[PDB]
Scaffold this active site. Structure first.
Site, PDB file in Angstrom:
ATOM      1  CG  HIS A  43      66.059  44.138  59.877  1.00 47.55           C
ATOM      2  ND1 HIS A  43      64.683  44.138  59.900  1.00 47.55           N
ATOM      3  CD2 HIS A  43      66.461  44.129  61.173  1.00 47.55           C
ATOM      4  CE1 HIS A  43      64.270  44.111  61.155  1.00 47.55           C
ATOM      5  NE2 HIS A  43      65.332  44.104  61.949  1.00 47.55           N
ATOM      6  CG  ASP A  99      62.998  44.179  56.757  1.00 43.38           C
ATOM      7  OD1 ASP A  99      63.935  43.401  56.481  1.00 43.38           O
ATOM      8  OD2 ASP A  99      62.845  44.661  57.896  1.00 43.38           O
ATOM      9  CB  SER A 198      62.973  42.351  63.572  1.00 43.89           C
ATOM     10  OG  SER A 198      62.945  43.706  63.983  1.00 43.89           O
TER      11      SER A 198
END
Ligand SMILES: CCc1cc(OCC(C)(C)CN(C)C)cc([C@@H](Nc2ccc(C(=N)N)cc2)C(=O)O)c1
Ligand SMILES: [Ca+2]
Ligand code: NA
Lengths: 250, 28, 5
Positions: A43, A99, A198
């Site tokens: 992502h 992810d 992230s």
């Protein structure tokens, strides 16, 4: 990272910064897994709901960093991307299942005191270490608060949470490719990853062989460091066959 | 072969300030 | 961010 602390020098020598060329800004964290391969969250690169779609030429990889904003002359190394590889079953439509993405560098990076790869777990490592209550370590240059930005790399140690407790904390569907970590309200202690973290690593130090293993990738969460909420992490071991397949072919 | 061994820590038998917290959690 | 060479 919310409620963490400054990293020591060379504490996380696999830490990578994904850095947008234009405008210059932090894109995400990531990790060094060999001299040529970098691991991150899909992502970080592909997220249509936010019109995010970065191609190889849009970003740089910065390795060996401590300071967020400084150009660390004689210390950090800057690498360009040859190719990005996103998991073909990455689920951006719903819950960020799988992810995970790999990036091959244009040239090998030289290892140094500040630059060194992390291990990836095997089945045994995962079974032994990925247990509720066992703590791992999350690092990044993301937000210090849900609602500013750190001078240097931040670090927080957080316990893995029981799967039922993770599930019961959210309306989002949790898959076998995810795990959650963080303290409970009754535990008193705090800490979480946040926006900007992230793609960064969740690592654990094996008590058997004294090596660091990347068990998770920072994926998502609802706010940061909220009571009764937990950070969600990509389960690296569960996706290792895909990792191997990509590296073996490419 | 040398993955996960930090030049400034494991390689020189020095410990970081909080790695003990992780070890202490690994109880089983 | 500081400029990169
Ligand atoms: C693409 C999935 C995603 C969603 C996200 O929520 C954004 C909101 C809550 C500010 C607004 N949403 C409703 C669009 C924020 C992120 C952010 N990542 C993130 C990672 C960890 C944690 C945490 N452990 N607390 C929190 C955030 C991000 O990448 O921007 C990613
Ligand atoms: Ca639920
Ligand atoms: Na929380």
């Amino acid at each position: 990272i919310v409620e963490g602390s400054d990293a020591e020098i060379g504490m996380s020598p696999w830490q990578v910064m994904l850095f947008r060329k234009s405008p210059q800004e932090l894109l995400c964290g990531a990790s060094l897994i060999s001299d040529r391969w970098v691991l991150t969250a899909a992502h970080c690169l592909l997220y249509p709901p936010w019109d995010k779609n970065f191609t190889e030429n849009d970003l740089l990889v910065r390795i060996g960093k401590h300071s967020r904003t400084r150009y660390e002359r004689n210390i950090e190394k800057i690498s360009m991307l040859e190719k990005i590889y996103i998991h073909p079953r990455y689920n951006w439509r719903e819950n960020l299942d799988r992810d995970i993405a790999l990036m091959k560098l244009k040239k090998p990076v030289a290892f140094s005191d500040y630059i060194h790869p992390v291990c990836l777990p095997d089945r045994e490592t995962a079974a032994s270490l990925l247990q509720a209550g066992y703590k791992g370590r999350v690092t990044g240059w993301g937000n210090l608060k849900e609602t500013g930005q750190p001078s240097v790399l931040q670090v927080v140690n957080l316990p893995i949470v029981e799967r039922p407790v993770c599930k019961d904390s959210t309306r989002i569907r949790i898959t076998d490719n995810m795990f959650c970590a963080g303290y409970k309200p009754d535990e008193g202690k705090r800490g979480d990853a946040c926006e900007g973290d992230s793609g960064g690593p969740f690592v654990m130090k094996s008590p058997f062989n004294n090596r660091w293993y990347q068990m998770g990738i920072v994926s998502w969460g609802e706010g940061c460091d909220r009571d009764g909420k937990y950070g969600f992490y990509t389960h690296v071991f569960r996706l290792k066959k895909w990792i191997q397949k990509v590296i073996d072919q490419f | 072969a040398d993955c996960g061994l930090r030049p400034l820590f494991e390689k020189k038998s020095l410990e970081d300030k909080t790695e003990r917290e992780l070890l202490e959690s690994y109880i089983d | 961010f500081e400029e990169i060479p």
